[PDB]
Paper text:
Specifically, phosphorylation of the C-terminal tail of histone-free ASF1 by tousled-like kinases (TLKs) increases its association with the H3–H4 dimer and downstream chaperones, which has been suggested to promote the provision of histones for chromatin assembly.
The structure of apo-ASF1 NT domain was resolved to 2.1 Å and in complex with the TLK2 peptide to 2.71 Å. Our ASF1a·TLK2 peptide complex structure data contained additional electron density absent from the apo-ASF1a structure, consistent with peptide binding. Surprisingly, additional density was observed at two of the previously characterized binding surfaces, the H3 binding site and at the B-domain binding site. In the ASF1a·TLK2 peptide complex, peptide binding at the H3-binding site is observed in all eight copies of ASF1a-TLK2 residues spanning Asp9 to Gly22 can be built into each copy, with residues His6 to Val23 visible in some cases. Overall, the TLK2 N-terminal peptide binding at this interface does not appear homologous to HIRA, while its binding at the H3 binding site is strikingly similar to what is observed for H3 in terms of sequence, structure and side chain interactions.
Residue numbers in the entry:
A (entry chain I): 9 to 23
B (entry chain Q): 11 to 17
C (entry chain A): 1 to 154
Write the structure that this text describes.
Amino acid sequence: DPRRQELLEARFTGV
Amino acid sequence: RRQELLE
Amino acid sequence: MAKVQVNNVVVLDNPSPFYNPFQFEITFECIEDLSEDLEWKIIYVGSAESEEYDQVLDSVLVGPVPAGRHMFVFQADAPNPGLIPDADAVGVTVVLITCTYRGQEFIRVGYYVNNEYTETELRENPPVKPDFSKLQRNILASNPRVTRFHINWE
């Protein structure tokens, strides 16, 4: 869960 | 790729 | 700053069946006359594990945009469950609304999305393979993440 949360947030900001 | 008109 | 500013996004029929289409009422404004189209996209994050399962649900061009404030309804068909990992089907994922000018993404509006069974029988004993006809999409519209990128507006 915590790792998947981190992954989703990256998508939100990403580049 | 598809056209959309403004409202 | 940027020549286009997104003022608001409204998620319409937000809690709905998975197979029903997305609907967003988007309102932006433009400081001056624009030479080319604004390309809007809706992107469904199929899997948190890899961006290669992203689905571009739709992509529209809003053509010649004057300098006023404008509104339009962006509707897109639901993602293709045949491209979604079963592990990611049920649970939380992300949907993205992006706008692009001359091929340069300048704004990205993201929402968390929870796909969940509504019958307690299924919630307590999930199908071995996600049954998308029984899933409810819940776009958590209260808290969007807005990310802006600098682009060339010449």
